[PDB]
Curated annotation (Swiss-Prot):
Gene3D superfamilies xrefs: 3.30.420.40, Actin, Chain A, domain 4
Entry similarity comment: Belongs to the actin family.
Function text: Actins are highly conserved proteins that are involved in various types of cell motility and are ubiquitously expressed in all eukaryotic cells.
Catalytic activity line of the entry: ATP + H2O = ADP + phosphate + H(+)
The name this protein goes by in its record: Actin, alpha skeletal muscle
Species classification: Eukaryota, Metazoa, Chordata, Craniata, Vertebrata
Description of how the protein assembles with itself and partners: Polymerization of globular actin (G-actin) leads to a structural filament (F-actin) in the form of a two-stranded helix. Each actin can bind to 4 others. Interacts with alpha-actinin. Identified in a complex composed of ACTA1, COBL, GSN and TMSB4X. Interacts with TTID. Interacts (via its C-terminus) with USP25.
Length: 360
């Protein structure tokens, strides 16, 4: 029977059937409760006023299992409209996901949803498979968290994994702030959803930050107009490139951590010397926050400036990197040499949660 692929994202839940072109269902990772006892996804925030909203998978890691259970329950019956007892289910997890976490991910799958078989894959790793690589370093920047994950011979290197608590969610908020400072007023939650659309449609990464700031202070060639739903037309200037700039300079929002370019460098320099030249030549971009135009040219420039001059440096930004993680799981599930890595109902009834250390 057709396997299931569910990418448990920090902001969006990508779910669908293994072997498909794209995930059939994409919805918010939010659980709302004060007509019913709970809501999940779009309608959870449509009625955000009467409910209490929950981000159980924010920052990449699942923290609440009652809410998560509601998200998975929403995925199976309401979105994909399948019987979880009739489908092997591949789950995804954030890098550096603790052991007891994937144990509990597995327990809930069998004891509560009764899956025939399941598996938990690291998100960044799947994105690499989707590119056609078993070796390389992935920059996974989603909604709630950004990870740098070096992968060698098809296996991620935990000690060199970098975690940056800065992603598109922080950027959206940042874009509201600086747009409000200019003279507008985007404060409400409904206005947040509007600003996020501006971010995805008009923002871009500046090749050189200061030079772009100068073109903005002296001309209006960088300015773009944006029509609000109520017909009102607003104008965005340097906020276009100042927004994603936070990924390289987290200090703009008080975050005293290294940028995505530096965390990439630091990640590689934690790996064994012999494979570093391979990581440099295979920098894969993953997640929606890496969708900014010009982010690859900026990454190319900054990594080069940090690395030896003799170093060959390549940046890979796939056009479908919004759904890289899910696609990677779709091919993994359909892979013949992977079938023996499933954890079956029988296997779990015999061993317990202790078996996920043997397969995952
Ligand atoms: C969607 O477009 C495409 C994407 C990729 C490819 C294809 O390109 C050539 C690649 C050698 C190939 C590889 C990378 C993929 O196979 C389809 C990928 C699924 C293979 C992964 C593995 O072999 C690993 C090492 C093993 C074990 C898994 C370890 N794990 C999950 C650790 O976390 O899985 C059987 O993938 C072809 C088309
Ligand atoms: N074209 C785009 N430009 C910039 N950001 C985008 C674009 N498309 C989506 N995003 C951002 O990507 C984030 C979604 O990332 P995602 O891959 O779902 O990560 P996660 O699975 O952790 O939520 C959202 O915060 C969204 O604002
Ligand atoms: Ca993700």
């Amino acid at each position: 029977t057709t396997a299931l692929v569910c990418d448990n994202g920090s902001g969006l839940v990508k779910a669908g059937f293994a072997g498909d072109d794209a995930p059939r269902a994409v919805f918010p990772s939010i659980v709302g409760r004060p007509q019913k006892d709970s809501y999940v996804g779009d309608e959870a925030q449509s009625k955000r006023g009467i409910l209490t909203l929950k981000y159980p998978i924010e920052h990449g890691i699942i923290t609440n299992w009652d809410d998560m259970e509601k998200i998975w329950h929403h995925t199976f019956y309401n979105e994909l409209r399948v019987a979880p007892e009739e489908h092997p289910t591949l789950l995804t997890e954030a890098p550096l996901n603790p052991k007891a976490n994937r144990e509990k991910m597995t327990q809930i799958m069998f004891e509560t949803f009764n899956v025939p078989a399941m598996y938990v894959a690291i998100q960044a790793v799947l994105s690499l498979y989707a590119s056609g690589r078993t070796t390389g370093i992935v920059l996974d920047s989603g909604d709630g968290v950004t990870h740098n994950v070096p992968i060698y011979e098809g296996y991620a290197l935990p000690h060199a994994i970098m975690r940056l608590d800065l992603a598109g969610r922080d950027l959206t908020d940042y874009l509201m702030k600086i747009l409000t400072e200019r003279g507008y007023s985007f404060v409400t939650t409904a206005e947040r959803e509007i600003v996020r659309d501006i971010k995805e449609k008009l923002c871009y990464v500046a090749l050189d930050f200061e030079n772009e700031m100068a073109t903005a202070a002296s001309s209006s060639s960088l300015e773009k107009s944006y029509e609000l739903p109520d017909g009102q037309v607003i104008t965005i200037g340097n906020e276009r490139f100042r927004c994603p700039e936070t990924l390289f300079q987290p200090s703009f929002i008080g975050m005293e951590s290294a940028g995505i370019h530096e965390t990439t460098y630091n990640s590689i320099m934690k790996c064994d010397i012999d494979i570093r030249k391979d990581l440099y030549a295979n920098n894969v971009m993953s997640g929606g926050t890496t969708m900014y135009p010009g982010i690859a040219d900026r990454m190319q420039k900054e990594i080069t400036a940090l690395a030896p001059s003799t170093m060959k440096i390549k940046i890979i930004a796939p056009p479908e990197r919004k759904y890289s993680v899910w696609i990677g799981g779709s091919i993994l599930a359909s892979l013949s040499t992977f079938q023996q890595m499933w954890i079956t109902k029988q296997e779990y009834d015999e061993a317990g949660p202790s078996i996920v250390h043997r397969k995952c």
